[PDB]
Design a binder for this molecule. Structure first.
Ligand SMILES: Nc1ncnc2c1ncn2[C@@H]1O[C@H](COP(=O)(O)O)[C@@H](O)[C@H]1O
Ligand SMILES: Nc1ncnc2c1ncn2[C@@H]1O[C@H](COP(=O)(O)O)[C@@H](O)[C@H]1O
Lengths: 812, 807
């Protein structure tokens, strides 16, 4: 009897919660094919005036009334699928919100109508004027949705919003949300304009302020390439930077919004990578609001994590508004990714095309409704449509709440139009240097050090005191000290980067007592730059994108990304190709990201030998990047400081050393640190009688030391060996300084560890030629060309190293 | 009591769903759910003695006392196996799983038990033997991987599986190679001693071998891979589709893909998603692959993206592992979908780990207790195995040397690029074919624009009209499948063509159906298949497919070349370098649409220069065909030569419709692929002051300008094949200009892109001793192309003009 039935009703409430969404009126076309637990009878009833307890269903209700309420709640225009989430209080939170809506009022409804009108009217104006649809029609409700999202952010103390989307709807969002001048857009179509090489109109970002009741929000819409889905981790990178510059930096204060298409989101693996990474300390941003523009489920990746998915019918702006707040409230409340599945169509399987043509547009559907509610007449709707058309004709901003940015919002202005060779405060006063050298070498006794580490630290105290030369790690960390000391923050990010893949850095010290850590660079003085090191793992495409976004938002911070080995960075080729190396020219976007790519031929094989130097060199042009191969601790130290101290903001690609990290000749003095500078080139270091010199060898990086040791060994005085430490921009001045004593030499050799089709030969040939004397010939010494970067077998490597070295040194 | 009956059913359902959160899974035990408690469901201790219907609980003792149902539920769902399956939507699947798990579980006989012990002993033994001799990425702590795979292989044999394809990574690799695949311990030992193309590290080696099971011989193929994690997965799956495509009897139990993943890598690499999402598609699907996660410490939740049953199992219990292995196989065989096994284990190379006994120890003990095998038994296993290692010969009893017919590559192994191949086709037959594939049954009702394209093609067959690019290209496929050579075309919109040039597939506007004329040439033809595509997994898959099947012409087409960098890892680590690293040949064709036409930085450049820079030691071909004839001969060459190396094509966009880019029947029937093309206009050699060389669409710009100018003193020559560089061909086309001293290389692409920097050194080789060589083309740039059309247009006109401007 009735005991048993009460239990059955609970089971029925439950089934609606779980799966009600699958019978929801989501599709605006009504051609969706809904494929159980949902009819009473499967749960054995008939009965509808029997009164029941209704469990947690936001006390007592006649049955048939409950079934009403459940169908409303879970089977109308919103499909909440949300009971996979394990947090009890989150579900209950949601239930509370949806299981109890107030009505919007005449002015909010009208306003919805107004934004649908703009959505449509812009799409139509552009159709008529420029018959060449990435039109938003009809996912028109995106405009009302974004505008509401932003208003709600305002009223919840959000200060900035960062957006990334793609092409569909792009022009609409630009004009009707971000506030770009229609006239500016119309001009773009006519070919009226930038002073780089540019990109197409659908990749355009935009920055503005937007006035809400709750205050002034900053809007930032990303630039992006045609490659789908990769702007995402760029955005959230962007937002971590912006959070990192607030004084108490709570997530709700910067909101990331990403807009996706159904196919891209299931089909692009950077989505997985991004979800995985947003979990990680040093990368989290308190969750992203993800909008899926659902045309042709797809949101099913959002269960690899576990996030609420709100599906909604684009044809109901009111339901759309409601879900918008719901999703936003949820994310600001619980610091978690949320998904809004915006279910719509492309006005622009010819069986549904016919469906679409006979279907009224969202503006139309809504104005008809506001008319059968006596909230706006035809004459009202019609005049919204006339007003908007007129405004387009006038060409001015059409977003009433757009405000021009304040001076203080222009964070990049100091950093534009600088050249690589500008002067910068290279020197640091010896007293202060040693003071810092000593502080970062000195670990409170509280911290129990592992044995090998404690040694390394004893060494660095001895470097500080002049009693021992700096190695790479000692000098590198000293660079960071000198930067944070004067207020410049550092962010270092990479696989195992706190200690170092090669055990060289030990910026972070693992306590053997507490199991905690201590990071010396964080304890210099009150009010220093922050210093933060973050250990990635994998997700390498998403990570570099993130750091690119970060460096892009924040030019005051020295932002470093370190690949385990350079060989792996091709996992991020799209970032390197579409953003880092080309973003300035395409988009005007500066970036001082530093990339540490361990690189060097040491016999460990094809994926542990080559950063593919040559690929970065071919990408170089128009001063776009710097490519450096530092050979000394002093060099790395000056190199990093230059990047921070010196105005320009352009990617620094570094061929980082592995074995040089402990080479006994790779070693530097305090005098070289304090009074030295970054040297684009380094001349011959030994005494040779220049009149006796028959050959100059030029080279970069570790192979230098092999040549040096071999030439000393041979007792040889007739061949000089010069380093080129910066291959791009190519340092002509420096080159003529180190070459002047050799004006009379006719035999010049470029020597490289790397194979002929690789390293610098093919790309930097023409520079070498510009720089050697008018007489001189120029020839190659190095490994033969090869399909694989590096041979498999150590004995073969060793023979090749010896052979290329002897060949360089051999004048016979 | 009616009420309690409903609630006992909910209790069962709770265990089905969530039992696994309380299963004994962590070997270490160093690892609370209200649903799992009878009290949660309003049942009491005193209820335990009462008896209930147990609905579908598959036991099937069809009513039980509750106390006892509870013992069973726990013994089923909270023992050494954790089953997550109830999130799957398919009733029959869930019922199927219930039938096999809720039953029972698992009685193994003494012969099998001792075989497990034996296999664990091998796993432990090899790893200690290596550790002692060469002080490795040891399997230790997941020794059960070994009996698992051997059982997987045995069970597949009894299932009529004929091939197994595995990819995995570094942990456990030496062990699998030796104790599963059959590599001789001596070979491994030599390798550690550096007694040995350019090669690669031992942890990347793959291996082929045959394996005698009770059910039949089974071929095993373990993939080569680079240091990069997880990208070998889609490669294996491609391999499998190829193996399935060569069966008369294309049943999917017949070939089994297995991928072995780490838990970090499985959630941190995007290819997993990409591969999971591609395995749904026609035809990249292969009837499901079984995925083993080697879990050291959830990482498996990515399989709910695709709604895969997931079996967790305690690696210290080899009988658990075996049962789950069979179950997984049977499900994949049965329902043709992916399945995950989560092997819960630990890395032996810290306090709790060190006084934890090895899995050999634990199971030897347990067989003692069971009087199935004694200290002395177990011990002699250890000693027999160490002795075997000392002798250095195969330690896999079931190993067998492969049959001649398993050597599918031996014909293709040692070939040069300029080898003679059967270029000519007899005119009668070309025309017969051209007519066949352009004639469509009248039942098929074509969209008007496609109908017009097809009439043009009938005109082309007849000689009325010169071939355009799509005409010739389709005709190439037709000539190959004609003679029994299969074709696989894979790419975005590749059926019709991104640029609407192909129309290999016709969409019948009446039936909603399709018709593909290349599939209807004659019975016994090569299969022709075009598939419409997750770029990185797709390319990886096509590569696997080509390394498996050298008889099929396998073509991948990017939507635009600019996007292929999405797949840089496949290019860098497999396609370009596999032959030298691994001895792995591959005739994969890549169509990369490429051309400066003013559509911006991502619709302009395939990055020719990046492929050029990867070229060395004859690894690849890079071609820029300028004619329908040329594309036709290029594709036929690739298929008809014995060489199997990647062919990277700069594929045209505009040229697809350029009025001058057309070709005659005579050029198709009696021509051949020309690595270089000479001056084509009547031009007096002694009038010529300058020779311009170039490739691809620029040619036509230069030609059309030169003709406008009525210029006779500048010859223009195409290099169609840029690598390997065609020295003989270039001499024939430059001979009549031996006296010219002014040579220009001219390219659309910016100065630091395209061919200039990489091919320079070839160019200087091949022009006359007197002669100078200078560049005409776009200036260097950081973006591949400008954002604005007008600027594009000026740049095009200027480089063309510069190149033609003599004195
Ligand atoms: N990485 C960058 N390079 C150059 N300008 C930028 C960069 N980031 C932001 N800006 C400009 O600075 C202002 C504030 O940017 P945002 O805070 O990102 O909206 C806007 O004018 C941006 O165009
Ligand atoms: N792509 C390839 N290149 C060269 N040899 C291959 C290739 N694929 C398979 N083989 C060899 O052919 C035999 C059978 O290959 P499989 O069927 O992959 O086990 C083994 O000897 C393989 O080494």
């Amino acid at each position: 009897d009735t005991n048993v039935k009460q239990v059955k009703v609970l089971q029925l409430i439950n089934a609606y919660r779980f799966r009600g969404h699958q019978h929801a009126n989501l599709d605006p076309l009504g051609l969706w094919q809904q494929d159980d637990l949902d009819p009473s009878f499967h749960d054995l009833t008939e009965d509808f005036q029997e009164t029941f307890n209704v469990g947690s269903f936001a006390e007592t209700m006649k049955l048939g009334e409950l079934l009403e309420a459940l169908k409303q709640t879970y089977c109308g225009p919103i499909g909440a699928e949300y009971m996979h989430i394990t947090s009890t209080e989150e579900k209950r939170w949601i239930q509370q919100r949806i299981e109890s809506r107030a009505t919007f009022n005449s002015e909010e409804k009208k306003r919805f109508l107004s934004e649908l009108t703009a959505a449509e009217g812009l799409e139509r104006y552009l159709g008529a004027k420029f018959p060449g649809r990435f039109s938003l029609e009809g996912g028109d409700a995106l405009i009302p949705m974004l505008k509401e999202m932003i208003r709600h952010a305002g009223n919840s103390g959000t200060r900035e919003v960062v957006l990334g989307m793609a092409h569909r709807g792009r022009l609409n969002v630009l004009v009707n949300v971000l506030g770009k001048k229609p006239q500016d857009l119309f001009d773009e179509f006519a070919g009226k304009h930038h002073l780089g090489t540019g990109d197409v109109k659908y990749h355009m970002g935009f920055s503005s302020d937007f006035q809400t009741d709750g205050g002034l929000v900053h809007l930032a819409l990303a630039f992006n390439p045609s490659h789908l889905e990769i702007v995402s981790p760029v955005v959230i990178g962007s937002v971590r930077a912006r959070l990192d510059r607030l004084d108490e930096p709570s997530s709700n204060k910067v909101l990331p919004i990403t807009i996706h298409g159904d196919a891209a989101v299931t089909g692009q693996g950077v989505v997985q990578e991004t979800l995985n990474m947003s979990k990680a300390r040093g990368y989290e941003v308190g969750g992203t609001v993800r909008i899926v523009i659902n045309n042709q489920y797809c949101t099913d990746i959002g269960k690899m994590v576990q996030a609420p998915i709100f599906h909604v019918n684009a044809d109901d702006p009111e339901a759309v508004a409601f879900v918008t707040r719901l999703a936003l409230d949820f994310r600001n409340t619980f610091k978690r990714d949320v998904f809004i599945d915006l279910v719509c169509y492309r006005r622009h399987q010819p069986l549904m095309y016919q469906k679409i043509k006979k279907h009224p547009t969202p503006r139309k559907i809504y104005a008809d409704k506001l008319e059968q509610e006596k909230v706006a007449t035809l004459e009202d709707a019609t005049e919204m449509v006339n007003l908007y058309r007129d405004a387009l004709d006038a060409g001015d901003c059409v977003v009433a709440e757009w405000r021009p940015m304040n001076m203080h919002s222009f964070t990049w202005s100091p950093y534009l139009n600088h050249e690589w060779d500008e002067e910068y405060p290279n020197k640091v006063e010896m007293k202060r240097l040693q003071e810092l050298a000593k502080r970062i070498s000195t670990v409170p006794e509280a911290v129990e050090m592992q044995s090998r580490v404690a040694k390394i630290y004893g060494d660095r105290q001895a470097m500080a005191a002049g009693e021992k030369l700096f190695d790479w790690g000692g000098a590198e960390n000293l660079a960071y000290a000198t930067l944070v000391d004067e207020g410049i923050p550092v962010r270092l990010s990479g696989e195992d980067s706190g200690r170092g893949t090669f055990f060289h850095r030990h910026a972070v010290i693992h306590n053997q007592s507490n199991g905690s850590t201590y990071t010396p660079l964080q304890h210099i003085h009150n009010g220093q730059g922050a210093f933060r090191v973050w250990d990635s793992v994998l997700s390498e495409e998403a990570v570099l994108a993130f750091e690119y976004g970060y460096a892009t938002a924040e030019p005051r911070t020295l932002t470093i990304w370190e690949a385990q080995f350079g060989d792996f960075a091709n996992g991020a080729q799209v970032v390197i190709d579409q953003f880092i190396s080309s973003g300035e020219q395409k988009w005007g976007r500066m970036c001082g990201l530093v990339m540490l790519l361990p690189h060097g031929y040491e016999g460990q094989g094809p994926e542990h030998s080559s950063a593919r130097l040559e690929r970065y060199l071919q990408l170089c042009a128009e001063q776009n990047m710097q490519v450096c191969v530092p050979s000394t601790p002093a060099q790395v130290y000056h190199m990093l400081r230059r990047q921070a101290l010196r105005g320009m903001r352009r990617p620094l690609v570094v061929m980082s050393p592995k074995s040089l990290l402990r080479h006994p000749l790779a070693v530097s003095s305090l005098e070289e640190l304090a009074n030295g500078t970054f040297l684009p080139a380094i001349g011959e270091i030994d005494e040779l009688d220049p009149k006796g010199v028959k050959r100059v060898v030029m080279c970069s990086g570790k192979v230098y030391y092999d040549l040096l040791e071999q030439r000393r060994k041979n007792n040889q005085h007739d061949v000089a060996i010069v380093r080129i430490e910066q291959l791009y921009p190519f340092p002509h001045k420096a080159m003529q300084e180190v070459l002047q004593q050799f004006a009379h030499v006719k035999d010049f050799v470029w020597c490289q560890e790397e194979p002929l089709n690789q390293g610098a030969w093919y790309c930097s040939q023409h520079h070498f030629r510009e720089v050697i004397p008018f007489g001189a010939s120029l020839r190659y010494a190095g490994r033969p060309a090869s399909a694989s970067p590096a041979v498999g077998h150590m004995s073969v490597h060793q023979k090749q190293q010896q052979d290329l070295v002897n060949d360089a040194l051999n004048v016979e």
